[PDB]
Structures are given as C-alpha cells and as structure tokens.
Design a protein around this ligand. Structure first.
Ligand SMILES: Nc1ncnc2c1ncn2[C@@H]1O[C@H](COP(=O)(O)OP(=O)(O)OP(=O)(O)O)[C@@H](O)[C@H]1O
Ligand SMILES: Nc1ncnc2c1ncn2[C@@H]1O[C@H](COP(=O)(O)OP(=O)(O)O)[C@@H](O)[C@H]1O
Ligand SMILES: Nc1ncnc2c1ncn2[C@@H]1O[C@H](COP(=O)(O)OP(=O)(O)O)[C@@H](O)[C@H]1O
Ligand SMILES: [Mg+2]
Ligand SMILES: [Mg+2]
Ligand SMILES: [Mg+2]
Lengths: 370, 151, 387, 370
C-alpha cells in the first residue's frame, strides 16, 4: 500500500492507493480560538483542524494555510499533515510511501519545502509530487485531453496528448472557489445580509454550494430574474433565521467566466481554455476539442458543462466536434487519479526514496518529478 | 504581532546630547594630562593645611565628557576630599568670594558626590549644599538642573 | 438661501445640510428623533414637548425624550422616523419648498440596494424633489481635498469605509466596509464605564457618552506606554461632569475606548482595524499604483478626529510594511514614504466635497435622476448612478 | 523634408530624414481604462497611447495593435499613427513624404492596408515601405552583408550581396522580445514573483531590458548559478518591493538559441544564420561571415555578440574568417538606415504617390516596394 494525499487548496483528501474514493476528506483549515476566557481544564486546545475547526467555528478564527495553491504558513500546514496521518487515516506515515499533489506553475520553493518537511519530519519511505491535472487524466481513463482543473484556490488547463504534456501551452489562473465565495460575501450585501467573520465565510460557502448555478446565457437570466421571483430561493442559517437569494445565485459563478466582476484582468475559463488549445500545434488541436476533461469542485455547478460547451463552441471553428467530459465524481478526480497512479506496476521505480533524498537534499524533486 | 515593532528609532533619528550641548574641543589625553597636573596641587594643599587654596586651584578647571569617567571620578575624589578638609566656619568666607561660574562648579560636583554615598561622606556635602544655596540663592541649583549631562 | 442644488449628508450620527458651493455645512444636528416620556426626573415649564421632537430640538431637551436613531451602520432602520428628520431638515432648518428642487444625497459604499431605492422614492414622493443624485460618501471627501488619487478612508458615527482612487478612476473591487465606527466606540465606552459601576442605559444618556467620548478620548500612540501611564501613574485620570451635575472619573477608558477602531476584537468584531484594513486594501491594488496610494492616504469623517489617530495610523502602517513586506529587515524602511492627510476640516469632508460636486454638475440636468424619469421607470431610474 | 518611422512591433520610432537619430520614440500601445467607475467631474480619454499609456498603465488594459510584425488592430493603429504625427513630431502629414517599414514574408494585405490609410486618412504626398533588414544594412557603410535582426515581435536574417536581395535564402522567425518577456514572466513564477496583468508585462519587460544577459556556455553557467549566488541581482518594482533574479536572468535570452524552451520546435538564432548563409550562392557565402550586422532592439543583450561569434564559428568550416558586427546604436538602426535612404540623392523619385494610387488603388505597392 501507498498513501495518496491531495493537498487541497481548501479541501484535503487522503486515502490508500487502489481504493476508489478518499478514505478521509476534510477542510484545509487550522482554526484558533478568538476568546481568551475559558472553562479551566475543560478539554480546550490551541488549534483545531479540519472538522474540529468547522464544528467549533463560531468561537474560532479560521485560516487556510494554502492560498492560490501556495502554502503560505508552514508551521500550520504540518498540523494538517499530522491530522491526515494520525487522526484521519490512523497510520504511522513512516510505514507507507506518500503521493502528494501540486498545481502547475507553482513556486519551486513550495515543492522543495514540501519534500523537505515530508522526509525531515514524517520520515515516509518514499514520496512523489505529481501535477494535479495529469493526475485527473488517469481517473478519466484516456491518453489525450485538455484537463480543466478548478479547485478552491486555483484553476488551470493542461493540454496533454498520448501522454506528452505541453508545458508551453499550460494556463493557470488564481480565480477559484475562494474568490467566488469572496464575491458572494460582497454581492449579498445588496440584500442587506452582512457576512464578515471567517466563520460566516463558511456559511456563504455552503449557500454557494447549495443554491448557485451557472446561467446558460447571462444577460437573459439577468432579465428573467428582474421579470419575476420565479428564480428566487431560500436558505436557513445556523440560527433558524432565513435568507432569500435571487440573481446572486448566478452572478456568483459568472465571475468564473467574467473575471472583471472582481476587477481582475483575465480571460474567463472559456477564453482561457481556447487560448490554451490555440497554443498547441494544429495536428493536436483536432482532438483536444473532443476531450475537455473537467476536475475539482469549482467545475461542479449546475449548468456549467453546457455553458462551458456553448461558449467554447463559439470560439472553436464549426467543422470541429467539441465535447466536455464532466464525470459525476469530478470533485475527487485528482485523488482517484493519484490512487490509480500509485497502484501502477510501472510507477514503482520512480518514487523518490529516502535513500536518494540524503544524496542530494530537496532539490532532487526537480529532476525526479515534472 | 506587528504592534510592538518600533520604527521611530530607524525612520526618525532623534537629537543627541552633543546636538544640544557643543562637543568638548580638548582631546581625552589632553584633559587627562590637565587634571593629573591639578590633583597633586589639591592633595598638597591638604597636606600643608591651606585646604581652601586647594579648592580655589582645583576648581580652576573641570573635566567633562562620556570619554573620561576614569578621570572625572579622580577629580571628584579630590574635590570631596578637599570639601571634607575645609573648616565649617571658613565656608561663608569662601562662598561669598566665589564667582557665579565657580559656585556653579561647586554645586554641580556636590550633586555628583551626593550620587555615590558608598564612596563619599554625604554629611559634609549636605553642609556645603546648605551654605552655598543660602549665600548664593536658589538659581545656583537651577543652573545645575540645566547643566551639561556629561558633567 | 440659494437657487443652486441643495446637498444633504444624512449621516448615521449627524445630518449635515446646505447648498452647492458652501465651504462648510449650513446646518448640522444629531440624526435623532424623540417622543415625550416621563422618567422620575426633573420637569420644567421652561420648554414645551411636542409629540415628535428631532435634531437640535431633541438633543437640547433629551432629559424629557425617548431618543431614537433612524440609522445604524449607514442604513435607515425606520423610515417613519427618517421622515421626521427630513421634514425638519427641509421645512424648519432650511425653510424650503422642495417642489422641483435638485438635491445631492450620500450613502456608504456597500449598502443594501433597497435603502437607496426607498431613500430616492421618498425624495420624489413625500417632498417632490425635481432631481436626485446619490454619491458614495468617501469619493465626495476626495473633491474636498482638491485631489484625484490616494486612498480615502472615511470613519463616521455608523460605518468606517475605504475607497482607493488612482488618476480619477475609482477602484470598485477594492472599496470596503469596516463595520466599526464612532457608535461602536460609544457602546464600548458605556461598557468600559459599566466596569467602574457608572450606568448609562437610558436612551437619552447615549448622547451624553457621545459628548464624553468626543471631549476626553485619544488614540494611544504606543500601547505599552499608555498602559504604563494607566497602571503606574494617576496622570490619565480626568473628571467629566454630566448634564445631571454628577461627576464621573475616567482614566484608562480614555485610550482603551477609541482603540477598538485599531482592534475591532474589543467590540466582538473579527474584522481587521484601520491600520491593517488600509494596508490589506492598498496592498491588494496593482503593482504600479501602490506608491501613489501610500503617498496620499486621506482621512475623513468625525470618527477620524481622535487625538493621535493620524500619528498612530502612520506609525502602524510603517510598522506593518516592515513586518509584512520587509520581514523585519531595517535596511529599506527609510525608502517607504507613507503620508496621511489629516486636514482641519476633515469631519465635514463628505459634506464639503458634496457641496463642491453639486456645483460641478448643477447645470447638467441629465446627470441627475429627474422626478419625470423616476415616475416612468421606478427603481430602474437609479441605474444612472454608476456600477 | 521627408518623414520616416520604423512602425515597430512594440516600440515605435519616428523622425525626419537626414536627422542622425529618431526624435520620437514611444511604446507601440493603445491602452483603455479597465474599470467602469470614474470621478464624474474629471477627464478620461477614450484611450491612451505611447508614454502617456505607459505612465497611466496601472488602471489600463494595454493592447499592442501590432503583433509578430502584423497590424492586428487597424482601428488602433489609426490612433498610434495619429500620435506619431500630431502629438510627438507635431507635423501636418500633407506636407511630408513618408518612409514606412515591414518585415520580409509578411501578409501581403498588410502592405496594402497601410498604403490605403496613409493616402485615404493621412493625406500624404508620397510614401515608400521598405524591408526592415535592408534599411538596417544602411547605417553601416555597406552593400554586402547578412543582416541579423531581432525586434519586439520579429526576428529575421536577410543576406544582401552588393545591393541585390537573395529571396531563396531570406528567412523570418516569430521569436523576439515579446516571447522572451512571456518566458521571463513564466519562469519568474518559479521564485513566486507572479506577474499576470498586461500592465505587469511592462515591469517584466523592464526587468528583461535591465537584468538579462546571454551566457557564453549555458550548460556550465546553469551549474555556476546552482553553486554560487555571485550572479544573482536585485531589481526594485514600482511599489518599492525588491526582487532577486538569478539563473532566470540568462535562461530568458537563451530562448533565442534554444527556441524549444517556449515549446518552439524550430532552429536557433545562430542556426538560422547558417541555414540562410549555407543556402546562399556557392562563393558569396564565404564573405557574408565578414559583414553580418546585428540590428533591432532584441540584439542589445550583453554577452550576445560573443555567443553569436562562437556558435556560428562552430557551425561554419574553420578554414575561413568569421566575425559579428554589433553597432552601439543597434536598437535604432532600421530608422537610421531609413533616415539615410529617405534623404539619398537618387531616392527622391522612388516613392508611390497619389497620381498613381488614385487609379491603381493600394494594389500598386507590390509592384515597386521590393
Ligand atoms: N473630536 C472627536 N473625537 C472623537 N469622536 C469624534 C470627534 N468629532 C466627531 N466624532 C464622532 O464622529 C461621529 C460623527 O461623525 P460624522 O458626522 O462624520 O458621522 P456620520 O457621517 O453621521 O456617520 P456615517 O458617515 O457613518 O453615516 C460621532 O460618533 C462623533 O462623536
Ligand atoms: N457541488 C458543488 N457545487 C459548487 N461548488 C462546489 C461544490 N462542491 C464543492 N464546491 C466547491 O469546491 C471547492 C473545493 O474544490 P476542491 O477541488 O476540493 O479544491 P481543492 O482541491 O483545491 O482543495 C470549494 O471551494 C467549493 O467552492
Ligand atoms: N538593453 C536591452 N537588452 C535587451 N533587449 C532590449 C534592450 N533594450 C531594448 N530591448 C528590446 O528591444 C525590443 C524593441 O526592439 P525594436 O527594434 O524596437 O522592435 P521592432 O523591430 O519590432 O520595431 C523590445 O522588445 C525590448 O525587449
Ligand atoms: Mg484542488
Ligand atoms: Mg459620514
Ligand atoms: Mg522594428
């Protein structure tokens, strides 16, 4: 057995290679109490992680040690790895080799300090640090594609063909499920609901997961929402108090297609995908239109796969046949992909072993890994 | 957290006592010579009993500066020794004939003698303090408050 | 009075009112409404209490009134009471017939849209103003400075909010609310004074602790120094005499009260305070403009007036670029020019700026939402007023 | 008088014929305000241009209307042309005959549509539109040579022998400072210096102009940077933060010699000299090696002349002498050569002019502009 641990930029996913879904999956949060007054001796502690942070959140300040796929806070990130191993998976990590996950175009010092602290603290037998989009390709069961990952903190395109990845054609954008939650906390102010605590951000995330959808055509849904309450829905807070939400259900996800809603200069995910395939050579372009694989929880909204198609088919030339591959398990596809990869007979020679870390230090990861 | 990191010390450099008082022109060895020639005149004036002419000559020059503690302390030792060897009935005849410049050198060093009682007898310095202030007025303490800190 | 547009900063704690080109508010008064009450207190024939008492008439007589506030956090909570402020403002402070007049209103940067709609509806349908414009309160304070760049932060009685501007473009993605201002510091002053046993929990006593805060409080420049003066020394202690004639001693509560703008956790908010809020806003702007924001931070609004706030805020941004950009390396700190603009007028900068803006657009009749345009499109007529 | 400009793929330069340097030089950019909200009492343009756009850039999307040497936005070129004439040189175009430029192997219609707007919108008495390489043989006192040029969006080799073009051996490569800026911007992500905005391309272009050099022995220079910090340098961004750039400073210009760094499976900058020289006639190829002038702004890198010398000398037979010619006025040399040509004592009859354009249309330009 090998461990597979997806370093989720908002949602950690951990399990054993060859198992068909994460054995444990929990928020990438470290929470600290925001109150000094305490019932003495009564079981309190100075850091709560994952589901201990969510279930206690009203008295905590919550902070994710990953932002935009980069670990900003290492003294807290090792608490999350300590939790994945000893409290969620309930193993000694020093018995099992660990497959870790990383975004493309990340700071090389992130992957160095990750491979360093994983051997230098948890003493795993061997480890590897795979790119999230090439992992998702294994779960989709194909050798050609243009994986569109969209997590909590990053979204990226990796054009890939018969296993040859195209590293000049990669696109990455720091717009994801966190920024869509920031924009929902912003626009809900227009209803007269004020959310400001890092606890209330998790309420606005749960609203966004339950009620938001991608408009198939935005300025037609805007006109429809102004024309009737037919589009409005209700949500009940962790207070019994009731929220009503309307065109905010699709103005939030629309940010993913119109980054100028959050002032950010970028192409939306349709134009970013098109400009990524148009950066590949013309013999490959004929096939990757038929293989837009989707990955990660921000690709999960109702209506996204159809609207992703109606936008990308306006940019692609009409002679092409253009398809989105969006599995019902797509939330975990990078972890299922890592679970497949770590189980292959042909992979077992290309782990980084503890023996060869000692011969070179952490900078070995740049030759052993993509 | 950041609230405690001082920045004023590294972005707004404050005044220094040498900006407020002009720096001494005489070099450290040049004053260390100038004092070491006077202390033997003061020690001699005690040994010949004319201790009051000892003070008049010792008080003709004063060492000052953060570079000279090892000779400011020797000058203070000689001054407190000379004050301990003048008869209390001679004090009013000495003080009324001192200039306001000499008085402001006496009372400046008696407040240095009063700062170190484990090495100086305070009882004779407090007696000189009463007599110098009663004769020459309260402003002679105000000129000590205002005086150079490296005296 | 004047034929030009009227301008009205209907603030959460003070109404200020006048006309275009006014250099200072024509009038200002507490944004309070009162109803008659009897309260085991003094009564006098020296004044007659009408069924609705407001503004100066209430605040001068509030021992006799159930005082209430039509606004909180920059939003109208009760429109039947805001109607009794607006009646007073137009009919017996300004002494105007509003029929067909043009008026400039203000509101903070992230209000509920239902507030601007019902505020414009009231202007068109109680009073019958011929034209309305609504400006974001902090962009008005930039016209007062005669200025076109540099982040402006406004702190009022209700809300503290920030609006970065560069070369006359307003950065709508960076505008922000801190829901802590001059009233939360006043509810906190009541809560600090309750530890000493002084109770101010009548509705009319709230204006007394506003006057007390406004008189005696200051922002500590160095917390371990004011905690030294507070715990080691009597020198902070100050005697305040209430309108009752009672004298109350106030001490650490002089600095420990307005500190909640710099530390909102003292009032139960998890938001970052002024220094960390302005820093996390400037440091979110694009790389080319950050210099021009730190070189011109503009303070505004009455809750920016605490003695020491300009110096504490400047220090606490130098102190915070040093932690979060230089990682504690002193070698580059002298290169960080930050400047706070803290002009004498700044309590009124939203009004003084509104009175400048209402001159710039007085004659351009299409720039205002007209009553004739409101009565055909309804609330959709307000889509003229920007993004 | 006559008026000349290299209508450059990133940096326009313009002035009067017979002047020894261009009197106007500015970014080939139209910028547009990026945010919807503006202070209602104050002025904003429809769009900004040149040094005004460059100094305004923090609030603008920046569009280069020329890309890879092709006019992509004629409606925006009509603004930067107008800017050369009425704002920078302060002329009335109806007084002055004009010399324009383009690269060899350009889209045929580019030559036509610039001719069309110069007569139908800028009213000029006459024009000509020369090959940028041919002008860059002038301003060196020369009539035989293989001119090597790299601009912002274009690179090309043109062998000229004794005043004759040699179009079997002429070739163009779509690598230049734009692609080197994209690659520098990409590899700077590896440190964590994320630059993404069209405005941040400009500060990365400034880092490329200031900090970069072409290393003489890349595979050993890379090992030198891995073993010593002595080649790392600091740059200060316009907000006052300081950026440490190391092995990325010579990896960037290396892309000219190894185009495979940007996924371009094509011959290197030195190899395109050999693949043109060794395609020239059987005897004249022996002295192109004595007359190879470098031109265009991308040829300004420190270290490039020494690299260019040693690499083409390794490809060529060592029986014959080799140099490289690298003028210090390199980055203006197209314009310096145009200033010479447009003032030359036989060129005053060479132009296209209205009396022919009014009956032939723009179709005449292909008949005498080569
Ligand atoms: N010198 C001062 N010291 C302390 N607080 C002050 C001072 N001057 C004014 N304030 C406070 O400022 C507030 C009134 O300011 P201002 O008129 O700008 O608020 P407002 O505009 O009515 O509020 P808002 O903008 O939130 O709607 C009150 O809380 C008042 O006590
Ligand atoms: N059903 C859903 N519909 C919409 N958004 C979802 C859904 N389920 C989860 N999310 C989004 O999924 C994101 C987490 O995605 P994930 O792929 O696990 O990110 P990461 O791997 O980088 O941590 C959350 O930020 C949330 O916004
Ligand atoms: N010192 C320098 N070192 C390297 N590149 C430079 C230098 N100075 C300018 N450049 C490059 O010059 C290029 C402009 O060259 P230019 O001749 O004006 O291009 P074009 O032929 O398209 O008109 C820019 O892309 C810039 O990157
Ligand atoms: Mg993810
Ligand atoms: Mg206000
Ligand atoms: Mg050029």
């Amino acid at each position: 057995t090998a461990l597979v641990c997806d370093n989720g930029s908002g949602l950690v996913k951990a399990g054993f290679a060859g198992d068909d879904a994460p054995r444990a999956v929990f928020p990438s949060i470290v929470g600290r109490p925001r109150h000094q007054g305490v019932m003495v001796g009564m079981g309190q502690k100075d850091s709560y992680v994952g589901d201990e942070a969510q279930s206690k959140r009203g008295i905590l300040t919550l902070k994710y040690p990953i932002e935009h796929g980069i670990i900003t806070n290492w003294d807290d990130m090792e608490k999350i790895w300590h939790h994945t191993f000893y409290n969620e998976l309930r193993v000694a990590p020093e018995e099992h080799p660990t497959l870790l996950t990383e975004a493309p175009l990340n700071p090389k010092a992130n992957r160095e300090k990750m491979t360093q602290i994983m051997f230098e603290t948890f003493n795993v037998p061997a480890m590897y640090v795979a790119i999230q989009a090439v992992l998702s390709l294994y779960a989709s069961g194909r050798t050609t594609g243009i994986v569109l990952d969209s997590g909590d903190g990053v979204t990226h395109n990796v054009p890939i063909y018969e296993g040859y990845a195209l590293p000049h054609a990669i696109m990455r954008l720091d717009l994801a499920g966190r920024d869509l939650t920031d924009y929902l906390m912003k626009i809900l102010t227009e209803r007269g609901y004020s959310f400001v605590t890092t606890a209330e951000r998790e309420i606005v995330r749960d609203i966004k997961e339950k009620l938001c959808y991608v408009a198939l055509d935005f300025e037609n849904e805007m006109a429809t929402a102004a024309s009737s309450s037919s589009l409005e829905k209700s949500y009940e807070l962790p207070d019994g108090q009731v929220i009503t939400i309307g065109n905010e259900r699709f103005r939030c996800p629309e940010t993913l297609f119109q980054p100028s809603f959050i002032g950010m200069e970028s192409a939306g995910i349709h134009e970013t995908t098109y400009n990524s395939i148009m950066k590949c050579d013309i013999d490959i372009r004929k096939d990757l239109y038929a293989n837009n694989v989707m990955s990660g929880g921000t690709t999960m909204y109702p209506g996204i796969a159809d609207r992703m198609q109606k936008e990308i088919t306006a940019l692609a030339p009409s002679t092409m046949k253009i398809k989105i591959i969006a599995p019902p398990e797509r939330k975990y596809s990078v972890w299922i992909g890592g679970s497949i990869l770590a189980s292959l007979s042909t992979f077992q020679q290309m782990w980084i072993t503890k023996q060869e870390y000692d011969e070179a230090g952490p900078s070995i990861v740049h030759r052993k890994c993509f | 957290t950041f609230r405690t990191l001082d920045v004023d010390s590294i972005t707004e450099p404050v005044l220094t006592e040498q900006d407020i008082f002009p720096i001494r022109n005489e070099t450290a060895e040049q004053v260390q010579a100038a004092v070491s020639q006077l202390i033997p005149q003061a020690r001699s004036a005690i040994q010949t009993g004319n201790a009051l002419q000892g003070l008049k000559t010792l008080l003709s020059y004063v060492p000052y500066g953060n570079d000279v503690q090892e000779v400011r302390t020797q000058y203070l030792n000689a001054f407190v020794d000379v004050l301990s060897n003048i008869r209390a009935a001679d004090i009013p005849a000495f003080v009324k004939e001192c200039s306001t410049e000499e008085i402001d050198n006496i009372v400046n060093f008696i407040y240095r003698g009063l700062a170190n009682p484990q090495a100086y007898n305070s009882s004779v310095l407090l007696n000189w303090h009463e007599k110098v202030v009663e004769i020459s007025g309260i402003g002679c303490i105000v000129r000590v408050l205002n005086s150079r800190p490296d005296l | 009075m004047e034929s030009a547009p009227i301008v009205l900063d209907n603030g959460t704690g003070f109404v200020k009112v006048g006309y275009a080109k006014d250099n200072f508010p024509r009038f200002q008064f507490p944004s309070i409404v009162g109803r008659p009450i009897l309260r085991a207190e003094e009564k006098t024939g020296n004044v007659q209490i009408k069924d609705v008492m407001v503004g100066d008439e209430a605040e001068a007589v509030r021992s006799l009134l159930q005082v209430k506030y039509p606004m909180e956090n920059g939003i109208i909570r009760d429109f039947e009471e805001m109607n009794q402020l607006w009646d007073y403002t137009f009919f017996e402070k300004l002494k105007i017939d509003p029929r067909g007049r043009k008026i400039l209103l203000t509101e903070p940067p992230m209000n509920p849209v239902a507030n601007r709609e019902k505020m414009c509806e009231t202007m068109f349908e109680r009073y019958g103003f011929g034209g309305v414009y609504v400006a974001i309160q902090a962009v008005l304070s930039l016209y007062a400075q005669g200025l076109s760049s540099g982040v402006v932060v406004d702190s009022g009685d209700g809300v503290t909010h920030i609006v970065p501007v560069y070369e006359s473009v307003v950065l709508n993605h960076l505008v922000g609310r801190l829901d802590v201002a001059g009233r939360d510091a006043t509810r906190y002053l009541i809560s600090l004074l309750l530890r000493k046993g002084y109770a101010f929990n009548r509705t009319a006593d709230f204006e007394t602790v506003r006057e007390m805060k406004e008189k005696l409080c200051y922002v500590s420049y160095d917390l371990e120094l004011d905690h030294k003066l507070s715990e080691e020394t009597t020198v902070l202690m100050r005697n305040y005499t209430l309108p009752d004639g009672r004298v109350i001693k106030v001490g650490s509560e002089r600095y420990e009260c307005p500190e909640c703008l710099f530390q909102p956790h003292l009032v139960g908010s998890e938001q970052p305070g002024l220094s960390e809020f302005i820093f996390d806003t400037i440091q979110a702007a694009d790389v080319d403009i950050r210099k021009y924001l730190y070189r011109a931070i503009v303070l505004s609004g009455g809750s920016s007036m605490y003695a020491g706030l300009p110096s504490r805020l400047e220090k606490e941004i130098k102190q915070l670029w040093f932690e979060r950009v230089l990682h504690g390396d002193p070698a580059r700190l002298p290169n960080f020019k930050v400047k706070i603009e803290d002009a004498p007028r700044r309590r009124h900068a939203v009004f003084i700026g509104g009175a400048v803006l209402a001159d710039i657009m007085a004659q351009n009749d299409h720039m205002w939402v007209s009553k004739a345009e409101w009565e055909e499109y309804g609330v959709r007529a307000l889509d003229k007023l920007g993004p």
